[PDB]
Amino acid sequence: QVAPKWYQSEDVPAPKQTRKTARPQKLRASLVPGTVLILLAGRFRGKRVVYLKNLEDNTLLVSGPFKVNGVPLRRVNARYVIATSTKVNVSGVDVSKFNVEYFAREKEIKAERVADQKSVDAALLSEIKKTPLLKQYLAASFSLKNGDRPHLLKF
Amino acid sequence: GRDHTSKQHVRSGHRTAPKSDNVYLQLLVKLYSFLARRTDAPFNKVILKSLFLSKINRPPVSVSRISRALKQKGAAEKTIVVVGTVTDDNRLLEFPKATIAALRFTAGAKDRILKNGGEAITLDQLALRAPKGQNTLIVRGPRNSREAVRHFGFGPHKGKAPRILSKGRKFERARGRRRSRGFKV
Amino acid sequence: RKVLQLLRLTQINAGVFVRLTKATSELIKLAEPYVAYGYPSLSTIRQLVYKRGFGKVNKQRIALSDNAIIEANLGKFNILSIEDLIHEIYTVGPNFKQVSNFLWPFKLSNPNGGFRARKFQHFIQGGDTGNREQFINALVKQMN
Amino acid sequence: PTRLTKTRKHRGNVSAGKGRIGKHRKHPGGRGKAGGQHHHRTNLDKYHPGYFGKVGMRYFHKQQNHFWRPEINLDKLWTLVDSEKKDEYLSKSSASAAPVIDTLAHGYGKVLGKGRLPEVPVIVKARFVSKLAEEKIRAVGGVVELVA
RNA sequence: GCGAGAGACCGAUAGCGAACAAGUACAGUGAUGGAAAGAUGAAAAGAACUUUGAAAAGAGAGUGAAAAAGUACGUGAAAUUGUUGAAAGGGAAGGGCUUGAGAUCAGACUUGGUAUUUUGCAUGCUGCGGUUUACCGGGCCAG
RNA sequence: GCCUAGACCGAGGACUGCGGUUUUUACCUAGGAUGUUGGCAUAAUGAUCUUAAGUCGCCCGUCUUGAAACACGGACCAAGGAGUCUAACGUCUAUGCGAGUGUUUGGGUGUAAAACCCGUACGCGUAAUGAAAGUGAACGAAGGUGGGGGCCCAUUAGGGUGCACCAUCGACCGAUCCUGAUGUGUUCGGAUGGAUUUGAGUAAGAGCAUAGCUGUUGGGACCCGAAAGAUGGUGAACUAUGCCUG
RNA sequence: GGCGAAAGACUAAUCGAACCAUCUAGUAGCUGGUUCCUGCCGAAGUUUCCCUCAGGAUAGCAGAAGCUCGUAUCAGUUUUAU
RNA sequence: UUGCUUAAUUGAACGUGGACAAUUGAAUGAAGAGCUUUUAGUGGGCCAUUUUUGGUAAGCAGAACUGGCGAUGCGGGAUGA
RNA sequence: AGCGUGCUACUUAUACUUCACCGUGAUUGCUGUUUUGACGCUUUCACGAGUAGGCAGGCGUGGAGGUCAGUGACGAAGCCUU
Ligand SMILES: [Mg+2]
Ligand SMILES: [Mg+2]
Ligand SMILES: [Mg+2]
Ligand SMILES: [Mg+2]
Ligand SMILES: [Mg+2]
Ligand SMILES: [Mg+2]
Ligand SMILES: [Mg+2]
Ligand SMILES: [Mg+2]
Ligand SMILES: [Mg+2]
Ligand SMILES: [Mg+2]
Ligand SMILES: [Mg+2]
Ligand SMILES: [Mg+2]
Ligand SMILES: [Mg+2]
Ligand SMILES: [Mg+2]
Ligand SMILES: [Mg+2]
Ligand SMILES: [Mg+2]
Ligand SMILES: [Mg+2]
Ligand SMILES: [Mg+2]
Ligand SMILES: [Mg+2]
Ligand SMILES: [Mg+2]
Ligand SMILES: [Mg+2]
Ligand SMILES: [Mg+2]
Ligand SMILES: [Mg+2]
Ligand SMILES: [Mg+2]
Ligand SMILES: [Mg+2]
Ligand SMILES: [Mg+2]
Ligand SMILES: [Mg+2]
Ligand SMILES: [Mg+2]
Ligand SMILES: [Mg+2]
Ligand SMILES: [Mg+2]
Ligand SMILES: [Mg+2]
Ligand SMILES: [Mg+2]
Ligand SMILES: [Mg+2]
Ligand SMILES: [Mg+2]
Ligand SMILES: [Mg+2]
Ligand SMILES: [Mg+2]
Ligand SMILES: [Mg+2]
Ligand SMILES: [Mg+2]
Ligand SMILES: [Mg+2]
Ligand SMILES: [Mg+2]
Ligand SMILES: [Mg+2]
Ligand SMILES: [Mg+2]
Ligand SMILES: [Mg+2]
Ligand SMILES: [Mg+2]
Ligand SMILES: [Mg+2]
Ligand SMILES: [Mg+2]
Ligand SMILES: [Mg+2]
Ligand SMILES: [Mg+2]
Ligand SMILES: [Mg+2]
Ligand SMILES: [Mg+2]
Ligand SMILES: [Mg+2]
Ligand SMILES: [Mg+2]
Ligand SMILES: [Mg+2]
Ligand SMILES: [Mg+2]
Ligand SMILES: [Mg+2]
Ligand SMILES: [Mg+2]
Ligand SMILES: [Mg+2]
Ligand SMILES: [Mg+2]
Ligand SMILES: [Mg+2]
Ligand SMILES: [Mg+2]
Ligand SMILES: [Mg+2]
């Protein structure tokens, strides 16, 4: 067998200086707060939900509302979402306190989270009631029927 | 595919190292590999190439060749450089005082050089008193005086030496070497 | 074969710039069944030199990624920039020979969109070889 | 060593470097110098002209001792002088006292005249000398003394 | 021929034909031709005895370090074959490439570091495996 | 000029460079991928074996222009099985010494086929040429001319000196042919000067020895293979023919 | 050599020259075979001579070793002149 | 310079000295040029386009130039040197 | 879905383009930091078909000199085995 030599070093070189300075994400023009979204993956796939805020994690803050849907305040990825053309006025909904640290990992749900759910859903429902059948629309699941071609459908 | 205008993967055809495994010749190559790589002096690149040469490509240099080279105009105090053996010549009537650097000296050659007030130094001693080969003069021995070259390119009307084991009137002198025996070539 | 070698066209889809005289025209006539040529515009020359421009530096194929590379090899001919080189090629200049020989032969891809149905017949007869004269620009756009 | 031979490298290749068409055979062309006048004429004429035929007269019972006569030239003549006394001789030699060089006792039959002598008188004892060798010896003030 | 000492020789299809009851067995009228064939175990301690069988043998037992050494004897390859198990199979089979399935194998929670409690050491608390929750960070596969 | 959809890739590994923005001896998209999140570590992941599916795939070796061939060898397996050694050589290479070189036929010696030591001869080389008798290599700085690496003087260039080597014109030695001085055993000698002649020569030696590969020749000669030829012997128990006795 | 009322028959399953051993590993321009891997380069079936035509030598094609040098002056090409 | 040549002081050949410098006298290219030694296999060939001879012709026989197969796999011509 | 002709798109070779890796050839640099590998390290570019054949670098076997004060009856060698 061939023994190792003295010139076979074990030191790990430092990496070169990388020039991959990150630049901000660009969302689709159809992704505007208040837009009704369709979730395509995850536990709540097929659920119609309201888009509220763009978090700094590149995720979207979303609520069902929980009373209408059972979908709570949570994050979704923009690529697992169909952004429809239906919109709800969310200018009266306060989503200031919600950010990445809000959804930090620490079943039992926090009292703060339940309170925020109720407070947000109150304003969301008040604005949702204005559009007839919008509450019924949000409470119904989405599915592709026979003869539905998503390359031809408008959402 | 490529339309090749020359043969592919062709080695240069020149020695890049000595065939010799003499460690001391390899120390000289180490010294002149550094000098040729770093001095811009054309002398050091020539010496490095000559250290690679085979024995027949480094013919012995007689002490008479050095004497004739020192008799060139303005070359009496130059340093004679021989990459090879310097041999003695008992046909000289006199030898000057000279500095000669060689791979090897015969006993007679070194004796005659030192007897006349000169120096017989090695090529490493040369590299310290002349690291750029200043005031030097490279002397090479005759290559075509070798006995093997007598028979190279033998043919009709070529005038070369036949490859023959015995010499005499009975050995390849009659037919083809004489018009009285047919033809002569 | 010798003519194509002297034009430095020793592979398929290799491109070279030639200054038209009687001698070079009579050269190109011999290689006509094997080449497609025409009159290149300034933008075609610029795109070729920018994307696939390489220089012959010590018999090595070196990318023209900095003006120092061009200057170190063509400054004695007053070429100090990639645009000097493009100008010297386009308006065939007094140092066209050195500038065009400094350029390594362009190695183009196959056309995006293909050739005509059968390449190896003259462009006049519905093929691809010979002189197409301004349609070399469309072909280079396909291949560069 | 057999391990350095090409026989070790030809192992696994069918013909052992002899060819599939030629098929290394016993003796194509004959044995030895066969066919030197018929099918090996092109070789002997090119490389060994003069091979066939007789030239000169025979010599029954040639004793090479009769023809023993090694040559020494003039440029090599002073190597027969004693090495320890060459330099003294090269200085103090005159017509009254010059070194004696017995060439026969050193194994030479004839003194030839190639080269140049030191301008120093010498006495050269030889069985034979050439015309120019003796002219060069006399010019430096020396003499050739014939012996047997 | 007789008597010795050796070897970069051969190692039982080799080396003399013959390592053995080998110029033997055997062939041919004859002259002549001419093999194959070494190895249980340190030691036969070569299996007493019981049982089934006409017997050969088998099954128990016994000797032995070993019977995966029983003279049909060290090791015990391949062709070829039996049994068991797995799998595949419409006028051959076999192969390469690719993936699936099944089987096998491999690998970072690293010689991981941070404080922590108890189990154990010859000993006077000290090197240090042990444990789970915390935190730092790491490995791999992915968005 | 601008906007926009997708795919494959991430070599490198402190800094150094070229640019750009300069709000700045700072920053950048500018000399090659980073950031972040989840899951998993009894596993997602990878490899191999077997098998299925898809696709392709004729039996190897051989001679041959051409083989899967309706050309030849090959049922299977194990073990054996074919460029060797030697004498003499060519080229090349390594090594020692070098106008020399080679101790080993032999002698000395020995820790005994070793190692160590010794020298005369001899071999090859240092002289060639002629059939031979024989003769036998400097006009010159060992020549001139054109190149020629290196070195020297320079300061692009230029000049000087130029080994090896190349082309070329000369010189010297031997042979051949011509001329033929003083002279003389009057037939010898051969000075001197020449010649589209000729040598495997000189012209400041390069060889000798050991080893290795490759190539050559003779040897069984890479291995196996004739029909034949020769020398010396054994058979008429079969059979052919004669004889003797039934 | 024998023997043959003759077929080249018979002479120990051997006969247009027995058998045995040796010379003898007879010679073969002819057939067959010729044993590990990878890397790089890479042909010829043409010239001339040969009782040469299934073979050799020779030149060519190929490899290897290099050597002298470093753009010097070359090319399976064009142009111009002839 | 010569012994060659001219009636010659004419020429022939080879020269000393001086002038013409990178457009040093067309293009294009040049993994550089030149040189040497040594040795292998081969010395049955065949095919395609075009020229071409004999033959009624031939997957016939014989030449010229080039390119191929032999020695070569890969995509196409179903298959095929 | 035949024949003549024109057009648009599309299909895919070991070919072409960009990139990774292997090897070969050339090439850049490396000693007051050469620094226990300079027969080494390193920069860059180009290239890779092959019978007969040549050469190079390696793999394996019997025995020999030296070395590992190497392995081994607490199991050498041999043999079988996803
Ligand atoms: Mg390629
Ligand atoms: Mg000589
Ligand atoms: Mg006659
Ligand atoms: Mg396309
Ligand atoms: Mg087409
Ligand atoms: Mg081969
Ligand atoms: Mg075989
Ligand atoms: Mg061979
Ligand atoms: Mg064969
Ligand atoms: Mg042959
Ligand atoms: Mg013995
Ligand atoms: Mg035996
Ligand atoms: Mg036997
Ligand atoms: Mg046994
Ligand atoms: Mg019983
Ligand atoms: Mg056992
Ligand atoms: Mg046993
Ligand atoms: Mg057994
Ligand atoms: Mg079996
Ligand atoms: Mg059936
Ligand atoms: Mg599989
Ligand atoms: Mg699997
Ligand atoms: Mg990387
Ligand atoms: Mg098929
Ligand atoms: Mg065959
Ligand atoms: Mg045939
Ligand atoms: Mg075959
Ligand atoms: Mg058939
Ligand atoms: Mg047959
Ligand atoms: Mg046959
Ligand atoms: Mg058979
Ligand atoms: Mg075997
Ligand atoms: Mg001697
Ligand atoms: Mg001699
Ligand atoms: Mg003589
Ligand atoms: Mg000489
Ligand atoms: Mg035989
Ligand atoms: Mg016989
Ligand atoms: Mg006869
Ligand atoms: Mg009888
Ligand atoms: Mg008859
Ligand atoms: Mg009979
Ligand atoms: Mg034989
Ligand atoms: Mg024949
Ligand atoms: Mg090739
Ligand atoms: Mg004849
Ligand atoms: Mg044949
Ligand atoms: Mg041959
Ligand atoms: Mg030949
Ligand atoms: Mg034929
Ligand atoms: Mg043949
Ligand atoms: Mg062939
Ligand atoms: Mg092909
Ligand atoms: Mg095909
Ligand atoms: Mg068809
Ligand atoms: Mg169809
Ligand atoms: Mg149509
Ligand atoms: Mg590829
Ligand atoms: Mg290859
Ligand atoms: Mg052996
Ligand atoms: Mg032990």
Swiss-Prot record, chain A:
Component of the ribosome, a large ribonucleoprotein complex responsible for the synthesis of proteins in the cell. The small ribosomal subunit (SSU) binds messenger RNAs (mRNAs) and translates the encoded message by selecting cognate aminoacyl-transfer RNA (tRNA) molecules. The large subunit (LSU) contains the ribosomal catalytic site termed the peptidyl transferase center (PTC), which catalyzes the formation of peptide bonds, thereby polymerizing the amino acids delivered by tRNAs into a polypeptide chain. GO terms for molecular function: RNA binding; structural constituent of ribosome. Gene3D superfamilies: 2.30.30.30. Component of the large ribosomal subunit. Mature ribosomes consist of a small (40S) and a large (60S) subunit. The 40S subunit contains about 32 different proteins and 1 molecule of RNA (18S). The 60S subunit contains 45 different proteins and 3 molecules of RNA (25S, 5.8S and 5S). One of its GO terms (cellular component) is membrane. Belongs to the eukaryotic ribosomal protein eL6 family. Signal peptide: none annotated. One of its GO terms (biological process) is filamentous growth of a population of unicellular organisms in response to biotic stimulus. Its main location: cytoplasm. It is found in: Cytoplasm. The gene is RPL6. InterPro entries: 60S_ribosomal_eL6, Rib_uL2_dom2, Ribosomal_eL6_CS, Ribosomal_eL6_KOW, Translation_prot_SH3-like_sf. Residues 1-25 are annotated as: Disordered. Keywords: Cytoplasm, Ribonucleoprotein, Ribosomal protein. This is Large ribosomal subunit protein eL6. It comes from the Eukaryota.
Swiss-Prot record, chain B:
GO terms for biological process: translation. It is found in: Cytoplasm. SUPFAM superfamilies: Ribosomal proteins L15p and L18e. Its main location: cytoplasm. The keyword Hydrolase does not apply. GO terms for molecular function: RNA binding; structural constituent of ribosome. GO terms for cellular component: cytosolic large ribosomal subunit. Keywords: Cytoplasm, Ribonucleoprotein, Ribosomal protein. Gene3D superfamilies: 3.100.10.10. Belongs to the eukaryotic ribosomal protein eL18 family. Component of the large ribosomal subunit. Mature ribosomes consist of a small (40S) and a large (60S) subunit. The 40S subunit contains about 32 different proteins and 1 molecule of RNA (18S). The 60S subunit contains 45 different proteins and 3 molecules of RNA (25S, 5.8S and 5S). Component of the ribosome, a large ribonucleoprotein complex responsible for the synthesis of proteins in the cell. The small ribosomal subunit (SSU) binds messenger RNAs (mRNAs) and translates the encoded message by selecting cognate aminoacyl-transfer RNA (tRNA) molecules. The large subunit (LSU) contains the ribosomal catalytic site termed the peptidyl transferase center (PTC), which catalyzes the formation of peptide bonds, thereby polymerizing the amino acids delivered by tRNAs into a polypeptide chain. This is Large ribosomal subunit protein eL18.
Swiss-Prot record, chain C:
One of its GO terms (cellular component) is cell surface. Signal peptide: none annotated. Keywords: Cytoplasm, Ribonucleoprotein, Ribosomal protein. GO terms for molecular function: RNA binding; structural constituent of ribosome. Belongs to the universal ribosomal protein uL30 family. Component of the large ribosomal subunit. Mature ribosomes consist of a small (40S) and a large (60S) subunit. The 40S subunit contains about 32 different proteins and 1 molecule of RNA (18S). The 60S subunit contains 45 different proteins and 3 molecules of RNA (25S, 5.8S and 5S). Component of the ribosome, a large ribonucleoprotein complex responsible for the synthesis of proteins in the cell. The small ribosomal subunit (SSU) binds messenger RNAs (mRNAs) and translates the encoded message by selecting cognate aminoacyl-transfer RNA (tRNA) molecules. The large subunit (LSU) contains the ribosomal catalytic site termed the peptidyl transferase center (PTC), which catalyzes the formation of peptide bonds, thereby polymerizing the amino acids delivered by tRNAs into a polypeptide chain. Its main location: cytoplasm. GO terms for biological process: maturation of LSU-rRNA from tricistronic rRNA transcript (SSU-rRNA, 5.8S rRNA, LSU-rRNA). It is found in: Cytoplasm. The chain holds residues 98 to 241 of 241 of the full protein. This is Large ribosomal subunit protein uL30.
From Swiss-Prot, chain D:
InterPro entries: Ribosomal_uL15, Ribosomal_uL15/eL18, Ribosomal_uL15/eL18_sf, Ribosomal_uL15_CS. This is Large ribosomal subunit protein uL15. One of its GO terms (molecular function) is RNA binding. Component of the ribosome, a large ribonucleoprotein complex responsible for the synthesis of proteins in the cell. The small ribosomal subunit (SSU) binds messenger RNAs (mRNAs) and translates the encoded message by selecting cognate aminoacyl-transfer RNA (tRNA) molecules. The large subunit (LSU) contains the ribosomal catalytic site termed the peptidyl transferase center (PTC), which catalyzes the formation of peptide bonds, thereby polymerizing the amino acids delivered by tRNAs into a polypeptide chain. Component of the large ribosomal subunit. Mature ribosomes consist of a small (40S) and a large (60S) subunit. The 40S subunit contains about 32 different proteins and 1 molecule of RNA (18S). The 60S subunit contains 45 different proteins and 3 molecules of RNA (25S, 5.8S and 5S). GO terms for biological process: translation. Residues 1-43 are annotated as: Disordered. GO terms for cellular component: cytosolic large ribosomal subunit; nucleus. PANTHER family: 60S RIBOSOMAL PROTEIN L27A, LARGE RIBOSOMAL SUBUNIT PROTEIN UL15. Belongs to the universal ribosomal protein uL15 family. Its main location: cytoplasm. Residues 1-12, 20-41 have a biased composition (Basic residues). It is found in: Cytoplasm. The keyword Cytoplasm applies. Keywords: Cytoplasm, Ribonucleoprotein, Ribosomal protein. Transmembrane segments: none annotated.
